[PDB]
Design a protein around this ligand. Structure first.
Ligand code: 2CV
Ligand code: 2CV
Ligand code: 2CV
Ligand code: 2CV
Ligand code: BR
Ligand code: BR
Ligand code: NA
Ligand code: NA
Ligand code: NA
Ligand code: NA
Ligand code: NA
Lengths: 93, 92, 93, 92
């Protein structure tokens, strides 16, 4: 369980570093700095306006932005689910 | 588990082929080509603006568009859940 | 499992009948007829624009519309989850 | 199971008291009174327009509003899930 939580944090920071680099200059309110990026990627992970609100406006400038977000969503919005189930199963003793 | 992942892919491509045909000419930014369609159907599967953003504007032109999306959502947003649980159970 | 699916259908139709009556005259594009209502309540069950898109505009005219939707969300967005888990557990033999 | 449901209610009312205090004067339609706050925090817990609709407009006035909502979302959108699974397991 602790190994899963460590994997997600390392993945979250690297993704937020990557996103700052890629879309910070063109979408500064969303990826302008690591802090803005970590907040956006959490919102993207929770799926709130991920497409209409974020990815569609982003993809308009970066046609292939989906190569980052779609797998990023597939990984985190699976790992979080796996982690949360992991705590629940471990709780029974 | 591998059988489930294969079923979802085949279903996803056929649905995206179908949607391109049905709503590509009237909603090209959303279903204009297979690529645009696969991206939209993933967004529809995650449920982001599926109604207000997609299905409601679509249904305005195609009154019965719900006959495609509602079952499509019912299938994928069940199979993905079944697949993800399938990996978790198999891991132990 | 079959008993759960029957309970949800009966609940869905009665809720959609109730909603047509309550908010059909003031919000016809959303609850104007049983068909429009069943489509809206599914969208509300999936949680797409349930508040900003539906309940907030509705509550503006019917201040207590939350007494219908909040429990309706609590019931269906629990029963569907319980039904889907029910099929998964029953599949193993 | 009953202990979990009690923990969530106590957490929900305290969070809604806190939010009324913090953002009621600047965002009254959203946190103007405990009732408005409890309705908003449920909508935030379901994740409907939590960022674009609520937290982003809020953070514009309170730059650190994320210190409240992100953990609030992390707690409730875990406890509800844990509670719902708890009823399902106890049913057998
Ligand atoms: C795991 C998810 C962690 C989320 C961290 C969000 C950090 C956001 C942040 O620090 N700011 C908001 C930037 O929009 C700057 C406040 O000064
Ligand atoms: C699930 C698979 C998702 C695939 C998305 C494909 C999107 C795509 O290829 N484009 C965006 C189309 O909107 C075209 C980029 O050139
Ligand atoms: C379970 C969920 C069932 C959903 C049924 C939707 C029915 C919608 C419908 O019949 N119309 C759309 C009304 O907007 C009228 C098309 O003519
Ligand atoms: C979870 C509990 C949800 C309670 C919502 C309370 C909403 C409410 O009382 N009002 C709406 C406030 O927006 C005031 C109606 O008079
Ligand atoms: Br997914
Ligand atoms: Br809920
Ligand atoms: Na949304
Ligand atoms: Na969702
Ligand atoms: Na959502
Ligand atoms: Na959601
Ligand atoms: Na949404």
């Amino acid at each position: 369980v602790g190994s899963v939580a460590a994997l997600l944090t390392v993945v979250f920071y690297i993704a937020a570093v990557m996103a700052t680099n890629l879309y910070g200059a063109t979408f500064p309110e969303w990826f302008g700095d690591l802090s803005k990026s970590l907040y956006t990627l959490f919102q993207v992970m929770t799926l709130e306006s991920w497409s209409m609100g974020i990815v569609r406006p982003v993809m308009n400038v970066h046609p292939n932005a989906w190569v980052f977000f779609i797998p990023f969503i597939m990984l985190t919005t699976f790992t979080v689910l796996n982690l949360f189930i992991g705590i629940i199963v471990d709780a029974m003793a």
